[PDB]
Amino acid sequence: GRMHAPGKGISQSALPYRRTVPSWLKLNADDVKEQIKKLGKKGLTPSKIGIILRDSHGVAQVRFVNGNKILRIMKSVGLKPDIPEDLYHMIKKAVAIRKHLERNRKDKDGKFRLILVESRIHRLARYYKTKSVLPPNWKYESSTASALVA
Amino acid sequence: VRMNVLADALKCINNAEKRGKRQVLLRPCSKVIIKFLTVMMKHGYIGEFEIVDDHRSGKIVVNLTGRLNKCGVISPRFDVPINDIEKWTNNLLPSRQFGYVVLTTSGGIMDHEEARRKHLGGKILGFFF
Amino acid sequence: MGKPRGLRTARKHVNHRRDQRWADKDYKKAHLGTRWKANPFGGASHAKGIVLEKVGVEAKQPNSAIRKCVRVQLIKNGKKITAFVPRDGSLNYIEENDEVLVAGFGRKGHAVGDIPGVRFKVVKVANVSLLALYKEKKERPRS
RNA sequence: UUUGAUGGUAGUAUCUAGGACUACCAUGGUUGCAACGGGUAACGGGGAAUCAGGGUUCGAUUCCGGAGAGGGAGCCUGAGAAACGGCUACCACAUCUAAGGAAGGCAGCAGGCGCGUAAAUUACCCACUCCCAGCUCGGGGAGGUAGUGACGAAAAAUAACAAUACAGGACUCAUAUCCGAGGCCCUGUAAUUGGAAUGAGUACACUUUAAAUCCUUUAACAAGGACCAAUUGGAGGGCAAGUCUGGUGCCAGCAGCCGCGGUAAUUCCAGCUCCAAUAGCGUAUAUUAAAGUUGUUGCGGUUAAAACGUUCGUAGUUGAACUUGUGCUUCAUACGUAUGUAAGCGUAUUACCGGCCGGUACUAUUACUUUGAACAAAUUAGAGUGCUUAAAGCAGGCUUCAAAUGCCUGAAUAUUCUGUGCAUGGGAUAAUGAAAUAAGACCUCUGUUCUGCUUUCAUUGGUUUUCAGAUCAAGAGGUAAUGAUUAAUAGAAGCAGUUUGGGGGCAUUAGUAUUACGACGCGAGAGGUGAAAUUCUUGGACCGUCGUAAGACUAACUUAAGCGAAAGCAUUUGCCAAAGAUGUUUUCAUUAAUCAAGAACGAAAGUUAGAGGUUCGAAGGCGAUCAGAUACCGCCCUAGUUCUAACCAUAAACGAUGCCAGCUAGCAAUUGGGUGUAGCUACUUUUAUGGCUCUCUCAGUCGCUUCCGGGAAACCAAAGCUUUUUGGGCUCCGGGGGAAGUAUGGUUGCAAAGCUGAAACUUAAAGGAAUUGACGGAAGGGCACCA
RNA sequence: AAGUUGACCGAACUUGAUUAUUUAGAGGAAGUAAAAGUCGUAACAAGGUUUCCGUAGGUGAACCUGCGGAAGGAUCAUUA
C-alpha cells in the first residue's frame, strides 16, 4: 500500500455480514433524508455526515438503511459539492504547503511533500475527468487554487 | 498487486502441500479458479472443498489428499489452438501418461484430454500433475 | 530474471535482443564492416602477395626459438603483413620476391600460439604448392 | 511547407483518378507504437543451410515480379518502347581517315584483356519443348546437343575360391596356470605352385541420336602381382591408435588449445609398425549446431560481469471480485446402474404458410478459437511405381511370349503462400457499451404532429380526404419490483480521533569546553616525543584563580532504540507546515502497479558572492627519523570547517541485495497503537490516572536455531516457493580479460568536471566461495645453555 | 522542306555550399609487448602509517595529506 510512502500498514472498517440491522430504530428508515441534508446545509462533507449520525440517531451504515449512499442522497436533495471531497481536501493540503512556503523557505522537505500531494491531485483529476464529474479543461493551476478551497 | 488470482491461489496450494498440510486457505476465489479446482477435484487430486461466503470477494478452505506434485499457472494466458496443443503438453507435463494442462476453451474450463476429443481450442489456464 | 511477462510485450522483447546483441563479441564482430577495413585479407579465405624480407620472430616464453617468418605485402590493397611458413626447409625454398599464396592460421583471425601477432600462413610460392615441394613432389622452377 | 508540403476549389494535362500540373483560398500533414536522416559488403518473394523444439545465417543464381543495357537526358514509328542487337545530343572512352569526314557500345552466345583467393569451347543442330511470320514447310547460339568440369548428389575397381609350406586357439583325448595324438568349427604369411572367375581396357558389328559420342547391348582380345601397384592425415592428452629404432640437442622444429624439445625426445626429423575415413581426405574463411555463452520456450545481477544515490512521473507494459449457473423430470444410450446426442420447469431463447419437416422475419461489438473459402509451379512433406538398385524420375502395367481403339489405372494428399482479409460455429477468457433529479424503456398505440406517392378522379384539369411503403414527434398525466453490484487483510480521503518520532523550516535559549585577552598569587620552567628538537618564558610563562568577550561543537544519558524518499537527523522553549502507524458497522468507488523521456532532493570536497573567522587543518614553512623521506611524528598556521544567497550532482550514496503483491517457522526481545488482567499499584479516599505485570493484538524491525528451502560455497524466513530448462506484474543492467569509462561527437557546467560512450591492437586466462600447507608488527598457551 | 519566334523537357561543364569516406603532418601525449636495465618498495600477514571509496591539493615514482564514507577489518562482544 501507500503509493507515495513506505508504510504498508493495513487498517480499515470491518463491516459485518448482517445488513438491515438496526432492529431497534426509533423512526422511519428514510428520515435520515431530512438529516443528511439538514446537516448538509451546515456545510458538512459526507464523511462528517457519515459519523455525526453514528452517534445521535445512531445509524450504522446508510447504504443499508436507505437504498443508496450518502453522496447520492445529497444531490437528490441538491447539495453536491462544486469539487468532490477527496479533491477538496487534497487541494487544501497543497494550498497550505504553498502558504507555508511563501514564508518558510530553506525547507526542502516541505517542498518535497508538496510534489507528493500535487502528483496525486493530478491523479484524482486525471480520473474525475474520465468518469465525467469533472469536465475537461479542468486542471490544477496553483494560482487560482486557494480561492476554491477557501 | 494481484495481477492474478490464479497465481495467488495455486502457489498458495503448492506451497502448503510441499509442507504436507491437509487444508489450504485460498483468497479470494474468482469463479475462474473454482472451476480450475473442479477439474482437479474430479481427477482425484483435491478433496471436497468449501466456499466461505463473505460478501466481499469470497474465501475457500480447500481439502486435499497429497497426490499433488506441482500445480501452477501459466501467465500470460496464451491462446492455444488445437494443432499446437501438443507443443504445450510435451515440454511441460512429465510424461504423456498423466498430468493435464487446463484450458479455457470456447465452451468452458477443461483439461487437455477432454478438449482434444470435444475438438475445442482456447487459452492456457494452468497445469497440474 | 526481469523480462516483461505480459501479453502485449512483443515490442519490448525484440527491441531488447536487438539492443543486447551488441554486447556479444561474436555477433558484433561480423556486423561492423571491419572485415574490409581492419582485415588485411579482403573479407576472404586466402590472398596472394609479394614478399619483402625473411625475418626471425622471437617466440613467446617459456618456449624460445626464432620462428622464421616472412613479411609480405599483398596486392589486393597494398597492406604489408607477416606470415608464418611451416615444415623446416621452407626458406632455402623461397628465394625472395617470388609470388606467394597466403592463408589464415586457424583461430578465426587473431593470433594463435607462441608466435606473437603473426596470424597468416604461406600456402603456395611461385605456383608450386609449398606443402608439396616440402616433401619434394613438386620442384620450384629455377627460372 | 520560399521552389507542393496537407486539404478545399475551378481548371489544364493524361488513356484515366490525383498537387500530376496551374490559379486562388485553408493551414494542415507525419512523430518515442521510432517519423525524419544515415548506413547497407540490400534487387524483393518463392525458397536454401543447420537443429528435439523454439530458432539463426543466407538468398548474384534456372521460377514469378522489379530493374537496367558505358554514363545521363531526349524521342520517333508503333495497340504496345522513354526500346539502346532504334535514333538524337552531351559526357567519358575508343575507331577509320587521302585531314574533308564516317561510324561504335558483348550486364545476348562463344572468345580476349583486366581485376582478382575465385569461374569452361572463338564446337553442333532446330529432332525436342514452345515462340514468331503472309504462317503444315521459313527463322529462332531461345532451345537441344557433344568438348572442359573432384561445385555438389547417386550406384561402386582395387580381388575371390581352395590346396600343401610354416603356423593359432579350439574341438576329442593322454592331461589340467606342465604335456602327446586327430594339430584345428582356425587363420595368417608364403615372387611356394597349380587352378576357377571375370569388367577395367580393347575391338567387329549393333543399338544410340537431327548427325553423333558415352552408357546399356556386344563377335574376336585381355590377371598372377614384379603388377590393372590408393592415397589423404594423425600415433602425449582432448581423440581411436609403437613408452619401437637411428638422428639432432630450449637447436631445428612441432602443437587448433594444453603443451613438447635443453646429447635415454611416448609430441621434432626419419626408418619399422599402427589407427581413422576411404576415391577420397586434409587446410583456410564464413555460417549453423554445440551455446542452459543472447535465454519466447530458457540465463545471470549479495560476493564471480550486473539493481539507477533517491523518490516522483508521462509514453508504455500490467491490472480485485461480480452477470443463466444449473437442478429436476425424462428419454433416446456404455453395461438395479452409466446420457456421453436431446427433451421437459425458472412467466415469450424470433412472427407466418407448407408435409415432425421447407420458404420465412429478425442477428451489442472486438480479440481468441473451430471448420471453411480463396489463391502459381518447382522445392519440402511425400502417395504410387522394380529407371536392375540408388538420388531421381511421372511413368507404366496387363491379356500376356499373342492376334488385338485390346483393356486397365496413373500422373495423390499436405506443410507451404507462416500473418493480413473473407465465410461459418462457439460466447470460457478479456476490454468497451447501456437507465440517474432521467432526450430511460415498452407502453399509455393518442392522432396532438408527421413526412410521401403511386392506384383511381374516361382522357384530362380544379375542389381534398382515406390507405398514406416509409419518416418526426405521441392526447405526456398512465399501466411496468421504474433504473446506482461488491465494498478488496487494493487505494484514496476524512475523523468528536488519541497519539508518537535526533523528520524538515524559522525564531528563541542553554551547556561545559577550547582559545584569546584583563586582573592577582607564584616562582623557572613549559609544550611536546620512540628519543628528540622546532616552539613558549625583555623573567611575571606553565599553573592556580576570578573574569569579560567571541566563534565552534551539542558530550555523558545513547540503545542492535526511533524518524526520514535517500543523502541525513540530538541544548531547551515557542510557532509553522507535513508524515507513518494504530483505531474506525467514516467517505468515494478501481481512482491502482511499475516505469524510457522529464522533474524534485542529493554526504563530503570543490566553485561563485558576501558575513564570519575558536578549534582543527590539504597546501606551504621549519625540527627530527632515515642510506633517502617532498612521508608517518612535532610546532605556528593558509584555502577550507561556520552562516547566508546561489552553482555543482558525485561516495564502499552498501544491505555491494530495485518496487508493489500472495504464500511458507520456530524462538526471544523491543518501537508505536489498540483491547480484557480489582495483575500490581502513586494517592484526592480506594476509584479517575500513572508506572510496570503477564495475557492478547496490528505494522514491523532486530536477534538467534535449523528447513519439506536454496546455493559453487560463504551463507540467506529470503538470497525460499527460479517442478523435473517456468510463467504474479513492472523497470534497470551484464555476456572472458585487458586496452578504457580512454579516444571522439553531442550535451550540462563559472571551472573542476558530470550524464552519455567505441575501436585498433593484445590476451589463455582474470575472477568468486572454500581446503591443506606456509606455523611472518597475528594474538594465545608452552618449551631448550647448538636460546 | 529549310530557316525561325516563344515555351517545356533537360544532358553537360563552371562555381558555391552540404554531406559521407579515405589519407600526408613538425611536435605533443597515452597504450601494448619485453621478464634479462635504473630507482625506490606501493599492495597482500597488524605488509610494518589497516585497506578501499568519493573529492580537492601536493609530490621523482609507486604514493602522501585533509574532509566525508564503507568493511570487502585486525571488533559480530561482554561496559545495571
Following DSSP, what letter does each residue of C19-76 receive, concatenated?
Answer: HHGGG-TTTTTSSSSHHHHT-SS-SSS-EEEEEEEEE-PBPPTTS--B--EEEEEETT
Nearest to A142 by CA among A81, A82, A80, A99: A99
Tell me the chain C residues in contact with residue B6 when contact means C-beta distances shorter than 8 Å. none
Distance CA B51, CA B29 (A): 8
Quick one: which H or E segment has residue B123? strand B122-128
Name the CA radius of gyration of chain C, rounded.
22
Interior/surface letters B56-71, b for 16+ CB within 10 angstroms, e for the rest: eebebebebeeebeeb
The answer to whether B112 and B89 are in contact (CB under 8 A) is: yes
Handedness of CA A91, A93, A94, A99 (dihedral sign): positive
**Per-residue 3-state assignment (H helix, E strand, C coil) for chain A:** CCCCCCCCCCCCCCCCCCCCCCCCCCCCHHHHHHHHCCCCCCCCCHHHHHHHCCCCCCCCCHHHHCCCCHHHHHHHHCCCCCCCHHHHHHHHHHHHHHHHHCCCCCCCCCHHHHHHHHHHHHHHHHHHCCCCCCCCCCCCCCCCCHHHHC
The answer to whether B5 and B34 are in contact (CB under 8 A) is: no
Q: Which grid cell sits at B115?
A: 478438449
Three-state DSSP at B8 gives coil
Question: Which residues lie closer than 8 Å to C11 by C-beta, 6 or more apart?
Answer: none
Tell me the chain B residues in contact with residue C6 when contact means C-beta distances shorter than 8 Å. 76
In this complex, the nucleotide whose C1' atom is nearest to the CA atom of residue C2 is D731
* B70 close contact with C: CB closer than 8 A: no
Nearest to C118 by CA among C132, C107, C134, C130: C107
Pairing mode, strands C120-125 and C80-84? parallel
The answer to whether C49 and C73 are in contact (CB under 8 A) is: yes
* CA of residue A2 to C1' of nucleotide D691, angstroms: 36
Distance from CA of B76 to the nearest CA of C (A): 6
Give the orientation angle of helix A85-101 with respect to helix A111-128, to 10 degrees. Answer: 150
* C7 close contact with B: CB closer than 8 A: yes
* CA of residue C36 to C1' of nucleotide D67, angstroms: 28
C5 with B77: Cβ contact below 8 A = no
Stated resolution in angstroms? 3.0
Handedness of CA B88, B26, B105, B109 (dihedral sign): positive
* CA of residue B83 to C1' of nucleotide D387, angstroms: 40
B 17-56: CB within 7 Å of strand D:
18-20, 25, 27-28, 30-32, 55-56
Distance CA C44, CA C31 (A): 15
CA–CA distances in Å: residue A29 to residues A32, A35, A53, A55, C86: 7, 11, 13, 16, 108
Distance CA A56, CA A33 (A): 15
Distance CA A101, CA B19 (A): 57
Grid-cell match 465525467, residue found: A132
The answer to whether A73 and A36 are in contact (CB under 8 A) is: yes
CA–CA distances in Å: residue C1 to residues A102, B42, B74, C4, C5: 48, 36, 16, 10, 11
Nearest to B128 by CA among B23, B50, B17: B17
- Give the number of C-alpha atoms closer than 13 A to the C-alpha of residue A100, restricted to the C-beta side: 15
CA–CA distances in Å: residue C89 to residues A126, C84, C94, C97, C142: 86, 13, 9, 18, 17
Distance CA B46, CA B13 (A): 10
Interior/surface letters A31-59, b for 16+ CB within 10 angstroms, e for the rest: ebeebbbebbeeebbbeebbebbeeebeb
Residue C99 Cβ < 7 Å to strand E: no
Three-state DSSP at B32 gives helix
The answer to whether C70 and C98 are in contact (CB under 8 A) is: no
Distance CA B98, CA B129 (A): 7
Pairing mode, strands B100-105 and B122-128? antiparallel
The answer to whether C47 and C41 are in contact (CB under 8 A) is: yes
The answer to whether A48 and A41 are in contact (CB under 8 A) is: no
Backbone phi, then psi, for C26, in 5-degree steps?
Answer: -90, -35
* CA of residue A24 to C1' of nucleotide D691, angstroms: 43
CA torsion A84→A86→A87→A88, rounded to 10°? 80
Q: Which grid cell sits at C101?
A: 599464396
Nearest to B111 by CA among B103, B123, B119: B103
Residue C101: what residue type? L
A 77-136: CB within 7 Å of strand D:
78, 80, 84-86, 89-90, 93, 96-97, 99-100, 104-113, 115-117, 119-120, 122-124, 127, 131
Distance CA A96, CA A90 (A): 10
Answer whether the bond into residue A16 is a cis peptide, omega within 30°. Answer: no
Pairing mode, strands B109-110 and C99-104? unpaired
- Ramachandran category for residue C95: left, alpha or beta (phi over 0 → left; psi -120 to 50 → alpha): left
Q: Which of C3, C7, C8, C13 to mutate to test the interface with B (most CBs of B within 10 A)?
A: C7
Neighbours of C137 (CB within 10 A): 10
